[PDB]
Amino acid sequence: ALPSGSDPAFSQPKSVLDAGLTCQGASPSSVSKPILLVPGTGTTGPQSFDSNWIPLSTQLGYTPCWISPPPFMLNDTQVNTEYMVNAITALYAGSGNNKLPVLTWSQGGLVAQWGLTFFPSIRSKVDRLMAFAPDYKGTVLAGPLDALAVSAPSVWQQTTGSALTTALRNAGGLTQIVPTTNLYSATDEIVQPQVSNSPLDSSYLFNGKNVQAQAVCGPLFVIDHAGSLTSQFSYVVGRSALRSTTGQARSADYGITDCNPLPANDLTPEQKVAAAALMAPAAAAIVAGPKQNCEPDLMPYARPFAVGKRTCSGIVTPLE
């Protein structure tokens, strides 16, 4: 999507946003075939991707670039999105005004879709989105009031029924904006519900290529939240999505013989071990990170889409 016209203002200075962006062996200002990687909750770019998509995308002929919004993607998802929008602007220009793919994990997919919904300028700059275990509807397992009654800003925002997920939906963001592949698992221990292989699932986008692992590999196939990113099966789907002339993974490119739940074949032993252990640093970062007792306020551009929801400043009222 609904939003059109000018991009909303950034809350952060451009220098700060630029500082959050790194490319492997290149500057964002001058880069061949960039791919933008957007990390999960409780991680930096390298922490999410060093053991997986950084080397995997390099072997596919891309220059991997990533953002690391501080602290470990725990702050307001709306701020995390500024890093991504700025990065797309930078990398589009830096590759000679060529569209670039965006590849994400977890919250990273929500961030990507938020950017595409509310910042119209990047819609023509993103070639495709390959999202692993995205939580567009949030999760019923977030538990912001479980244990200590405070939780990270972005954990509030990723809780099902949040003002943020409300705004995304009501602005048209549950339909794909660029060609999108969503790879996810019914057994995801972080993001639920994911079990239905239908629009009920948190990772589902209308018109998207929605690939629930169990729909391909069978009802008893098990990959968790991290495995959704790191598995050989995930690699085969991601490879298809990145190569496809439709901008989405193709069913003919993957099958039952690709149903390997272990870390991608082409990873080094060290990378495979690190890929298996992906969740550990994230849990540690969440434990020691910022926490509060309310969902962060929506930025003005998003408020009209969640009237009636409650954030830190109170109930969202209509915006003049």
Added chain:
Amino acid sequence: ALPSGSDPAFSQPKSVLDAGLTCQGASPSSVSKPILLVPGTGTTGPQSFDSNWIPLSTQLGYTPCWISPPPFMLNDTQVNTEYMVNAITALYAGSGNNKLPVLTWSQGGLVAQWGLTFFPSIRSKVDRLMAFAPDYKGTVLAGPLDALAVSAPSVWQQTTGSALTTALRNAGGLTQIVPTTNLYSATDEIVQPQVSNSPLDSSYLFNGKNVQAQAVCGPLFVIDHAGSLTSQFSYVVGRSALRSTTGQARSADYGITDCNPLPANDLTPEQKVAAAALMAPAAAAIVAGPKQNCEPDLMPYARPFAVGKRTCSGIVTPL
């Protein structure tokens, strides 16, 4: 005619097997009215039963005991069975040479029936078997063997067509050996087929008390794989099976009134919540657990019963 003669040798030492057995507030060597609980795939004893049959069997006057074969029942089902056979032997002696009931979930039932088939010594030590969602035929939801993803030893073995399930059937193990009750559900999302209310069902044993939930409660009655263990309906049938003088649940003890799919009434609100989330640890153990590209070899005692099947070492022969 069932396997006879001496029990097969254990691959594991007694001390290791003993370490897998725990009783609630008792030593296995001296326990009043033990019940042996055998867990599902990807779980320990406490993970399978803390929220359900541990407290429920306690209220019925038993001392719950359980085995926890490492790692989380994902190893070869034949080794998991050694844990059970050892436990039955220990608990029989620990309760003054009196037969004891065995209560199982999922793979646990397969383990119990495998033990009864191939280890004759325990036939005289098991009073009755109460099996919830047992997969005696394995499951077809895994797909065919030649297409199976790298999987845990016991996951191979529970795939329909496996050498293990073949051996159990051909040795005579799909007919009850001790008085057995099998409680299962047509809507089981892990174990199929279960829809026919007939010998076709994976949970069915000939001569057993075979209780498909929907045959009593109607086609709208829904309990999943975990719900087959934890439901109020499951409790009533289980209570019947444990008390019955025939050693099997009696139709006189359960009916339409008992058709409640929610966790057993007597469980605390927290136990009910934990019961509903029974499956989550299983997924986690599978992710972190052993995986291989072939079905584990059958032990020598079982080989004659699966000739022409393929395991890791090659084609099964009588050897």
